[PDB]
Amino acid sequence: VNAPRVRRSVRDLQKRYDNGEKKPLEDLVRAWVGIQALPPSDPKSFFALGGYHGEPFQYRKPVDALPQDDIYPYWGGYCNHGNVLFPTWHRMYVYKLEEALQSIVPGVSMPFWDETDEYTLKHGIPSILTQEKFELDGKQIDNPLRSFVLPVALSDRLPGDGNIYEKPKGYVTVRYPLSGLVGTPEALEQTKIHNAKFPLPEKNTELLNSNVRAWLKGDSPTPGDPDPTRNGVYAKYVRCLSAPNYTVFSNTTSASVWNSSNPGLVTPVESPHNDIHLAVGGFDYGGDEIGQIAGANGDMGENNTAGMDPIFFFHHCNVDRMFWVWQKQTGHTDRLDIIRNYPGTNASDSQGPTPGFAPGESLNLTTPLNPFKKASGEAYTSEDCINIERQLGFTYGPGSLDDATPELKSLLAVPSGNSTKKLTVTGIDRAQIQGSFIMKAYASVTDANGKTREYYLGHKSILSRWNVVQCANCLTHLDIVAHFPLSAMPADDVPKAKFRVEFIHRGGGVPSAAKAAIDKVSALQPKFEVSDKL
């Protein structure tokens, strides 16, 4: 009805400030200072809001206690992942934090970190999100956006017990290349050793910016034009805008099954999203190695405490913008549909049921997006946030990838004579894993002379969670199934290829769980299968 508020690019707000129009950036900072200073029992404090995502958890004590053959994974946070509520839940999450910012500074808008604009590709994260200080009211302050100090502890307050979920009062959030897993003596010990290697704030920010550029590129970042390859996060965000329906656009579970039953490759918005979390939250895009431990256990790297890092919301505002662009480019600004009973539409899927959900329960456009409530006191659903302009009163200003162009079509195109086929990787066995991990796929072909060529087929980011489990035997058993284009390779070379996957993982984040990560990830033989041509 009324003209939408305009969510704008954070980079654009910083440029306006750089040139003397400071009010916009100052309002945003002032709002963030205000929500960070509200008491933690207030539903609009940053601590409460960040706490909605993951920890502090609610538990299912009778489930935690089940034996190995009976137990099933569940999520003690409210956030929806690996399921069709991913986009809409996070839409409301961002909106709800924005309602909180507005309680400090009326009519302020939550901007977006435009992750795929020219600035980010060439320089990484805008410095307003990383810098130490800000000038507000002619006083220097700590930048509330670089990190957040916990006002109370994340703790289950169980007598005698400490675990890797737990984080003390005064804990400050960290990003790559630092670690902040501290709830057991060994985690804390490993964190202190790891962080001793990275003592200089300015160098740390350079490393982070450079990691973000490499992830976006899909290779080590070149000076000049940025040149995104077809494997990077840039390409993956472009791909997601072509996902053919909301179900497979929405989440990794739906997309995986779609990719096993349809020709070609769809990419859910959740995928490139996952990448940004891992880059910012402690995974080096890295390279060609057999395997690697990501010891930077940053808050953004797992779902447990990512919501306590302010950058979570700048990122997720960009993910919401991509969701809105997909709605516009595909005709879904006013309606969504979900394939009934498709993988991704069950509470049991992926992370498992959120508080108050039961195993087997169906997720649909009617499902409560807990804990978000309308003025009525009634639970928001997906049906309430399809159209951000008509139902929520805001829109997205201009930014990268608004428009389907020819330049973008071709970046996704199979070069002529290169393979149109896809690789399916299944090491369906084990999956007894602690924290997030990356799968990187390679093909090597040895010609007649004995000269080996390596083809990099791409990455897959599994954004997961830290786990505390009551039996030494069963953590949470999972199908490894991953698809990769073979478009990096000449079509006729596919039959001569020897495939491998490099896992990059947390390896427990500890020294008592790094002897079943060198020798149990190395005693896992993936199966590889190659489809028909298109």
Add this chain to the structure above:
Amino acid sequence: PRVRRSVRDLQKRYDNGEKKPLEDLVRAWVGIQALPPSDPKSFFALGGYHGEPFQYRKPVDALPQDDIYPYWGGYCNHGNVLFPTWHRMYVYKLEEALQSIVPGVSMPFWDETDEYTLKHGIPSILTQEKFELDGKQIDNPLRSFVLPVALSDRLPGDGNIYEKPKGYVTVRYPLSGLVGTPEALEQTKIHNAKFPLPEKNTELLNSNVRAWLKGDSPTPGDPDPTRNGVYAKYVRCLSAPNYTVFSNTTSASVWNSSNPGLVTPVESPHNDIHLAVGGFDYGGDEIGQIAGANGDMGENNTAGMDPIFFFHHCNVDRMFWVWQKQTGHTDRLDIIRNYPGTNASDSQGPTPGFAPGESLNLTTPLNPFKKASGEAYTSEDCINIERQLGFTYGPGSLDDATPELKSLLAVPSGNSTKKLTVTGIDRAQIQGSFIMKAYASVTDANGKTREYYLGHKSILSRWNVVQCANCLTHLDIVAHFPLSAMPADDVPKAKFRVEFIHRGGGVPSAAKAAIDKVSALQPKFEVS
């Protein structure tokens, strides 16, 4: 019939030229500490049997606060009639491992009540840093033990106060060894920085051990054990009327609520020594409520990992043998059926393989100890140590009842023969061992006031890791104290009080709540 001797005796003999006894003892201890953790004669396995590493009952651990009950994941029996005979077997079984290394070797006893200990504390051979074996300097294996593997539940993502890393060294008063959470380790680091010198620490410990034995601050001349010290309590225990109440604190407590006078079970002074070596200052209630020196011996969790546990328990067995001799129970023991102390639910709760409500008797198996035939040992197998186990106790303190020992426990002419019962401390939460000290003040109409110390009670207990806020063990505290220190006409004027020394929840985040509860307690006082 092999003889077990005073270790002070073996040490005198060493300093006078005769070294093979002490050298054989040390060699055997080096031997069993060097065996691998998976060998059931390794010291790690043997110390493991007592307490941690635990076997759990996960369905019980998940019970709600109204349904949960305490149980013990170690094999040791405590607060029940198998306390004396289970520990008898336990020491015997560690002697067998020592014999694995050095055939025919005998496990001595720390004679806690000899003249040396009253005046100088622990024999230095148990505290010395170093020892001469085969004209080489080795680390003294009796001083402490280094864990060859972690005490760990090996639960991914979890760490609790039960857990101690590989390379952990055992510690005594005045040091703390609770390290399984970041909080406990940090407090341990801060507490231990207050006690940085090993020589001073050894002095502090010897002085606390003397003060416990005496029952007041140690005097520099002759020892002068009061009626309230651990000396007196060991003496009182040799008069226990029957095995049932000799054997454990649950039986003796109900006996003392139901009969005139006071009995002392051998488990009681035994608890005293644990807390003395394991972190409690006898004088601690002049300073504060919290005993921060969380040493292995001070709780049942890891006490068995500290070598001195076996020298002490060798003396506890001695006292049980002596009680047997002096009361003619060398060959037969009796259990009052269904008396408190005869149930697996009593005190620490059931050991592995026992069920709530299950009876305990002389046929009950003393797990995990098994004969050459693979059959489980029972209390029937170990009543006469000479006849069935093949060893005796050499001479040492207290083995004869005498006029001097009778006049120590006896009420000064004109003093009260009555007794004080302290209760009204219903449903307290247990985290670690604690001590009660009772006092009386009397004020005349003219306004003069005298102060009386009535004595102490040591509750040897455990660390507890729970799955809910209010899911700790609950305990009714009941404690009985003699009134012998008071003149009889002051008793009706008296105002009684108790002081507690406790662990404060084990960690700083649990301390203020613990202190508030204890300070709030309004105990009831009852005079017989």
